[PDB]
């Protein structure tokens, strides 16, 4: 995406019920900070979740350590918190090369001034002034107003921790629910006229795969005829009727 938001200004979207290959980014390797939390990064294309919400924002290149489950900082206390046992993966890499220009990218900001801690997955957008004691301002920016949004500056000349990083937050949950987005599944081709194991969409067996003579009806997958002799299976790719012996 050519346009992002600040870490306090992050957006929440949701992708459900399709195919998403996540490990295809491995050999793509536009990475700096490949990391998952609490789950193995391999089998995300194998098994999958519901409530597969997604986030995206910009982070200055030094506070990347603060994205850690429970570990506080500029981000987890004041900008965006991920809880103890953050179900998800967070992978970061540089965005100086497009989401930064000369003179400083003074468009993204960060919240610093807030009384208390944040929530899991919290969008802490507000228009509130700070107070360290008991006496607030009268509107004009002074000694304890503390407009919490100080402008991030991203020049093409800064250090190594002073660069904008593209980073996403994979907001995941586990509620017993209909099954949304998973990885695309390895549809290896068929074989005919040989005793062979197979595994179709869930159900499986082992025998030969040959043609038929009889037709199906437009919602059929597999046919059993006498006492679950599941023999007449239409193939899921070519949508043509086959037989199992």
């Amino acid at each position, epitope marked *: 995406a050519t346009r992002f938001a600040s870490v306090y200004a992050w957006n929440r979207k949701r992708i459900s019920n399709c195919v998403a290959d996540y490990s295809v980014l491995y050999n793509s390797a536009s990475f700096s900070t490949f990391k998952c939390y609490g789950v193995s990064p391999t089998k995300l294309n194998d098994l999958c979740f519901t409530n597969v919400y997604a986030d995206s924002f910009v982070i200055r290149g030094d506070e990347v350590r603060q994205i850690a489950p429970g570990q506080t900082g500029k981000i987890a206390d004041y900008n965006y918190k991920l809880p103890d046992d953050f179900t998800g993966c967070v992978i970061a890499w540089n965005s100086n090369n497009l989401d930064s220009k000369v003179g400083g990218n003074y468009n993204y900001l960060y919240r610093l001034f807030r009384k208390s801690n944040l929530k899991p997955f919290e969008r802490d957008i507000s228009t509130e002034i700070y107070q360290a004691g008991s006496t607030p301002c*009268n509107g004009v920016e002074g000694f304890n107003c503390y407009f919490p949004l100080q402008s991030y500056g991203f020049q093409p000349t800064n250090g190594v921790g002073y660069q904008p990083y593209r980073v996403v937050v994979l907001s995941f949950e586990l509620l017993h629910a209909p099954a949304t987005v998973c990885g695309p599944k390895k549809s290896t081709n068929l074989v005919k006229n040989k005793c062979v194991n197979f595994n179709f969409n869930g159900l499986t067996g082992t025998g030969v795969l040959t043609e038929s003579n009889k037709k199906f009806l437009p919602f059929q997958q597999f046919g059993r005829d006498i006492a679950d002799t599941t023999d007449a299976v239409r193939d899921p790719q070519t949508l043509e009727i086959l037989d199992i012996t």
Partner: antibody
Amino acid sequence: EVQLVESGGGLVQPGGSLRLSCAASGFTVSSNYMSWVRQAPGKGLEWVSAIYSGDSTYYADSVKGRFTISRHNPKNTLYLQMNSLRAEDTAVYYCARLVGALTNIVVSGDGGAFDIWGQGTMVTVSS
Amino acid sequence: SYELTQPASVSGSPGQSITISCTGTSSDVGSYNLVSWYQQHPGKAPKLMIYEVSKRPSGVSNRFSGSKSGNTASLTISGLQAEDEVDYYCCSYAGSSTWVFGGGTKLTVLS
């Protein structure tokens, strides 16, 4: 080298101008809160202006529109251009660094002090 | 033009207590914790003694202490010395990011 340098005052007609130069030392005005203090010698202290770190210029009542404050972030000098001079401007002009949380002596709370001081200048406004 | 209201002269004994007030308005003292007190030698600049009204600075002599009660503030001074007889002023956050200074308090040292 904590130092404030107020000078440049002299013979200015009522109806003219004079630009001071508070050479701030020991810190930078690019990241510290600043203010001016005017005072007839021995009389009461009288506040003038507040430019903040990052050039947000705030004034007092009488000097609102009259005095003109300016700085230079590498040069570290607090200037006081002065238009619409009155006969009550017989006063020694002290620049004084305002203490906020970006001032190095306050962690939490309120700040609000002047710790580093100078000598004052003698801007005489008389016919 | 725009100052803070004080009695111009108080007096006390060495080793005893005295309280110098700082009465302002409903926009400078009664809504901000920044009645700060300075130490001006006549002919010199002021000198930082009291700021952040209830808090005490680092290593500075404990003979000055400020307190704020509504609109009328105070400078609870304990233990006068010979080095307390200069021009004294209170400074307040005068609202809308403006500032204000005192009307002067000339502490006359006895004995």
